Amino acid sequence: VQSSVLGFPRMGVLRDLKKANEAYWADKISQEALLAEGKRLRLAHWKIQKDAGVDIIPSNDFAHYDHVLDHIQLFNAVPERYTSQKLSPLDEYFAMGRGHQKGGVDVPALEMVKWFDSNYHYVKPTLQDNQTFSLAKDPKPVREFLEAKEAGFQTRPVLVGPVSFLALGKADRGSSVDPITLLDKLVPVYVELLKQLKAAGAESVQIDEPVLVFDLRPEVKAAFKPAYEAIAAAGDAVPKVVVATYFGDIVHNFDVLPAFSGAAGLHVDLVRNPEQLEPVLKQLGPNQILSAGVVDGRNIWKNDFAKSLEILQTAVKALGSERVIVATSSSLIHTPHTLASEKKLPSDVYEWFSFAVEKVKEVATLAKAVTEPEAVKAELEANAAAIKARTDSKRTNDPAVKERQAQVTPEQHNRKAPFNTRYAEQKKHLSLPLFPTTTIGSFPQTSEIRVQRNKFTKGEISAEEYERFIEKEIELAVKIQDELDLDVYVHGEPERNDMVQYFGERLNGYVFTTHAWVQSYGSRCVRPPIIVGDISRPAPMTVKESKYAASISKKPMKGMLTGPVTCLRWSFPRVDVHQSVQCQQLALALRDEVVDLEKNGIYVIQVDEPALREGLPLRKGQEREAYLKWAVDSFKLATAGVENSTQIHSHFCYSEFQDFFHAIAALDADVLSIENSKSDAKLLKVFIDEEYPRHIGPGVYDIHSPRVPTLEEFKQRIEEMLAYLKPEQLWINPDCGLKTRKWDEVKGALSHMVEAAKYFREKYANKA
C-alpha cells in the first residue's frame, strides 16, 4: 500500500520563506537569491518526505505567497493593471498579492479571503467579461516537477481544478461575468498543461476540487462533466488523475461523481468525516483508487494508528490493497513544520503531538502497517501507549470541571429578563444620550507599548514597573476619551498582544509553543495556542486593568473579552473529546470572568466572537445546525450571568450575515457593532427584514485608513444608516479596534464622529 502527502508547509523550519520574501521586498537580497531560497526549501522538504518513506510526494504545493495566486499567473488570468507594469514574473506575482507602485500609479492587491473553514487566505481569481486563458511561459508545475525529478524526487503535481478555480473566483471591477461561464475557455489550458506534465514524466496528478464539500448551485455542478470528460478524452497523453476533496464530506454530491468516472482515484477527508468512508466506497468505479485521508492535516495531535488502521482495513477489504492509498486528510500547510523545534513544552504533552515532519512519517508507517504490521510493531506499540497516556492523563480527567459541566442547566443560558424589560434598567444606569458614541476596543499600539511588553515578558523589567506603565497608559486613554466627550469608554488594551494568547496564558488546559508557526496571509504566520486538557480559570484574567480603568472613568467602561468559540477555534483544539465539550468549559471559565468584571465596577461587557462564522460546517444540514446550537449556547452561557442593568456587547468584523443572522439574533446581545463604513448602507436591510429588536452600531469610520473623515462625511454616513435603522437603536462607533492607527488620526476622526453624533442629537431633539 502506498503513502501520500497532499502538500507540505512552505515556510521552512525557521520561517525561512518569510525572512527571504521580506528581505527581497526590502531590497536586501536579489531576485536570484530569493528564488534560490525557494528552491532550497522545496528540495529540503522533498527530502524530508522521501527520507520518511512517503511514496507519493507532492510538487506544485510550494508557493512564495499563495497557490491560487500561482494559478492566476499560470493561466495568464492577470488583469491589465498588473501586466502593463512590465514587471518580472515574480514582481507581477507579488503585485497581485501585496500591491505595487510603478511610476505615479499605485496598484492595489487582489482580494484575499479565507480558504474554506481554515485560517489560510487565498487570492481570488479576478476575471474580465472578455477573459481568455493561456498557459504561462515556463509553467510553474512543470518547472517544479523537473526540479524535483533532477534532484532524485519523483513527485505528483498538485493543481487546483478548473471548477474550483472559477467557483472561487469573481468578476473584476467593470465586469459582471459569472466566472463559471468561462469554463469552456479555461478547460483547454488545463488539458495542455496536463499534456506537458505527462511529457515531462509525471505519471499522476492530484487535482483538488475542494468546492465539492459545498452546497453547489446547478451551474457549478454542471461544470464538472465537460471539464473532466475533456481530461479523460486525452487518454494516455495526460497523467492519471486523483480528484481531491477535504474539510468536509461529499456524500451530498454523489450526483456529481459520475463526472470523474474516467479518473484514476478519489481523495476523501476521513478525519473530518470518517463516517463517509463506506457510502463513498459504494460510489467508486470498478478500478478507481481510494485515497483515504486519515492523518489530520488541520491539527497537531499524534495519529491514533489503531483507529486509522481499522478504517484502512475496511477500505482494503472492500477494494483490495492496490486500490487504497494512505493519505493526509488535507494539505499539511495548515500544520507547523516540526515538533523537534519545541524545547519548552511539558514533557508529558510531547508524546501526544505530531507536526508536519512527524505526520509525513505517520502516513508511511500506516502504509507499512496495513500489510506488514510486524515490520513496525515497536512503532505501533509506542503509538498505542501514547494514545492511552493521553486518555489516562490528569489533564484530560479534571473531576471538578466534569462535575461543573454535569450540573449546567438550560436556564443558566438565559438572561434574567428579555431586552424590553432589561433596557429600561440599562438606559438610566449608563445614562446614554441618543446616538451614544463609543469605540470597539484597542487603542494605538505604539513602539513603547510593544517595547515595554517585550521587556516584561523577557523579565528585563519587574511586574511592579510594568503594572505602573500599564496604569499610565490607561490614564492616558481615559484622559483622551474625556477630551473627546465619548459616552462609553474602553481601556485600550495596552497590556494585550493577541486576543487569544492573552486568555490562553491565563487558563488551565493550554500550552504554548515557540516555533509552531502556520502560514495565514501571504508571509504573515500565526502561532496558535494548543488546548491539551480540560479548561478552567485559576484567577481573574482581565479584572486588574478593567477595575483600574473604572476607578478613574467618568463614563461607563467596557470590559473586553474574547468569546468561547474563538478561544477554541483560534487555538488548536483537542481531538479526544468533542469541540462542544471544550467550548462549554471555556464558556464557564468566561462566565466567571464576566461576573468578576461586573463585581468590580464594570457594567458594559463586550464579548467578541470573530471565529464564529469561520467555524461553520461547509454545507447545510444537521452538522451545521449542531455547530450553531453549541456555539450559540456557549456564548449565552458565558454572558447570561449578568444583572439586567449590565449591557452585553458584541463586535462582528463583517457587514453581511448570509445564512446565519438567526445565530447572531439568538445571542441576545444588548448592543451589536458591525463593520460597515466601506460598504453600501443597503446591507443594513437585513436588520429590517429580520425585525432586529436590539441595538446596533454599524461602523462609520474606516479604521484601516490613516485619513481623517470630515464632519460632513460622518454626518452623511449617519444619515445613510438612519434610512435603515431606528434612531433609538443606533450607536455611533468605528468599524473596528484602533490598534493600527496613530493617536493624531484617532483624535481627529473621533472628534468629528462625536460632533456628528451631537449634530444628530440636536436634529432629533424634541420640538418645543
Binding positions: 18, 119, 440-442, 493, 524-525, 570, 608, 651, 653, 662, 675, 736
Residue 5 CB, nearest approach to Zn ion (Å):
36
Closest CB to Zn ion among residues 281, 526: 526
CB neighbours of residue 689 within 10 Å = 8
Residue 594 near residue 607 (C-beta atoms within 8 A): yes
Give Cβ neighbours of residue 542 (< 8 Å, ≥ 6 apart): 559, 560, 561, 593, 597
Nearest to 59 by CA among 74, 69, 49: 49
CA–CA gap between residue 236 and residue 316 (Å, rounded): 27
Q: How many residues does the chain have?
A: 768
Closest CB to Zn ion among residues 533, 737: 737
Closest CB to Zn ion among residues 490, 736: 736
Residue 380 near residue 305 (C-beta atoms within 8 A): yes
Q: Which residue has the cell 446581545?
A: 669
Which positions make up the binding site for L-methionine?
440-442, 493, 608
Residue 739 CB, nearest approach to Zn ion (Å):
11
Which positions make up the binding site for 5-methyltetrahydropteroyltri-L-glutamate?
18, 119, 524-525, 570
Alpha helices in 214-286 (DSSP H): 218-221, 224-233, 277-281
CB neighbours of residue 685 within 10 Å = 12
Handedness of CA 206, 209, 210, 213 (dihedral sign): negative
DSSP states of 703-722: TTS-----HHHHHHHHHHHT
Nearest to 457 by CA among 491, 497, 492: 497
- Residues 539-575 as b or e (16 or more Cβ within 10 Å = b): ebbbbebbbbbbebbebbbbbbbbbbbbbbbbbbbbb
Nearest to 677 by CA among 764, 759, 758, 753: 753
Choosing from 413, 515, 704, 752, the catalytic residue is 704
Interstrand relation of 265-269 and 240-244 (parallel, antiparallel or unpaired):
parallel
Give Cβ neighbours of residue 175 (< 8 Å, ≥ 6 apart): 127, 128, 129
Closest CB to Zn ion among residues 59, 439: 439
Which positions make up the binding site for L-homocysteine?
440-442, 608
Give Cβ neighbours of residue 599 (< 8 Å, ≥ 6 apart): none
Closest CB to Zn ion among residues 597, 736: 736
Closest CB to Zn ion among residues 45, 739: 739
Nearest to 124 by CA among 192, 191, 200, 67: 67
Residue 497 CB, nearest approach to Zn ion (Å):
17
265, containing H or E segment: strand 265-269
Nearest to 311 by CA among 328, 287, 292, 296: 292
Closest CB to Zn ion among residues 250, 664: 664
Residue 746 CB, nearest approach to Zn ion (Å):
16
Task: Name the residues that contact Zn ion, by CB under 5 A.
Answer: 653, 736
Residue 40 CB, nearest approach to Zn ion (Å):
39
Interstrand relation of 530-536 and 558-562 (parallel, antiparallel or unpaired):
unpaired
Give Cβ neighbours of residue 242 (< 8 Å, ≥ 6 apart): 156, 204, 205, 206, 207, 263, 264, 265, 266, 267, 289, 291, 325
Residue 207 near residue 243 (C-beta atoms within 8 A): yes
Radius of gyration of the chain (CA): 27
- The SS3 call for residue 269 is strand
Task: Establish whether 71 is a catalytic residue.
Answer: no
Residue 691 CB, nearest approach to Zn ion (Å):
25
- The SS3 call for residue 581 is helix
Handedness of CA 113, 118, 119, 122 (dihedral sign): negative
Give Cβ neighbours of residue 768 (< 8 Å, ≥ 6 apart): none
Nearest to 242 by CA among 292, 214, 208: 208
DSSP state of 211: G
Closest CB to Zn ion among residues 596, 608: 608
DSSP state of 674: E
Handedness of CA 441, 443, 444, 447 (dihedral sign): negative
Closest CB to Zn ion among residues 512, 661: 661
Nearest to 605 by CA among 661, 566, 643: 643
Residue 441 CB, nearest approach to Zn ion (Å):
9
DSSP states of 138-165: S-HHHHHHHHHHHTT--EEEEEE-HHHH
Residue 676 CB, nearest approach to Zn ion (Å):
10
Strand segments (E) across 512-557: 518-521, 524-526, 530-536
Closest CB to Zn ion among residues 82, 503: 503
Residue 637 CB, nearest approach to Zn ion (Å):
23
Closest CB to Zn ion among residues 95, 703: 703
CA–CA gap between residue 525 and residue 190 (Å, rounded): 31
Catalytic residues: 704
